[PDB]
Ligand binder design. Structure first.
Ligand code: URA
Ligand code: SF4
Length: 194
């Protein structure tokens, strides 16, 4: 049987791709197992690696602030993870073989949580989830800021791509766009399906 607990244990000791050799801590993700909103980023950065926790550096602090101020939620009420769960070396993005190796953990996490909404933060997570959906992916610029319905198992999941929070740290305009995207996510979260 599968569980978020089992996945967490596996990730923490995982050596299924070459990223394990560099890490201090793998980062399985954290949050409410019955979260209505699931956030998926790219991969851990430096502070995430040090702490074993997703989105805790500057970009993460911005994410937390938007979740709190715009969605009206604490981190413990949502679920937050990444498509790749170890920090790639040298500030680089995950290789495709690393996404291929690690993404079954995310698949398993989604299978268990079955959130109402998945917010895909940035191009890597958006491209990955679009591939599972069978939704055409052009670029994050072209696809962000609206919802995509993912018929999955017995339910529908609303997928909402946004820019990654890191992109909003030093760009006032991009930040405003991300905030507006989170306002739209709030409306989707509080509105009953009809
Ligand atoms: O957890 C993290 C931290 C930074 N960037 C991400 O994509 N995820
Ligand atoms: S990135 Fe994923 S697949 Fe690779 S070692 Fe870490 S947990 Fe395992």
């Amino acid at each position: 049987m599968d569980s978020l607990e089992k996945i967490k244990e596996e990730v923490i000791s995982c050596k299924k791709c070459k990223l394990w050799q560099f890490r201090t801590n793998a980062v399985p993700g954290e949050g409410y197992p019955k979260a209505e909103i699931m956030f998926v980023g790219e991969a851990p950065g430096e502070n995430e690696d040090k702490e074993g926790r997703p989105f805790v550096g500057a970009a993460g602090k911005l994410l937390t602030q938007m979740i709190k101020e715009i969605l009206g939620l604490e981190r413990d009420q949502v679920f937050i993870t990444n498509v790749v769960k170890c920090r790639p070396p040298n500030n680089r993005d995950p290789e495709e073989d690393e996404i291929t190796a690690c993404s079954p953990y995310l698949d398993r996490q989604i299978d268990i949580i079955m959130p109402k909404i998945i917010v895909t933060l940035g191009r890597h997570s958006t491209k990955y989830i679009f591939s599972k959906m069978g939704e055409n992916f052009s670029s994050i610029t072209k696809v962000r800021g609206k919802s995509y319905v993912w018929k999955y198992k017995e339910k529908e999941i609303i997928v909402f791509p946004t820019y990654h929070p890191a992109a909003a740290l030093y760009n006032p305009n991009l930040r405003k766009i991300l905030e507006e995207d989170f306002k739209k996510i709030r409306e989707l979260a509080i509105t009953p399906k009809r």
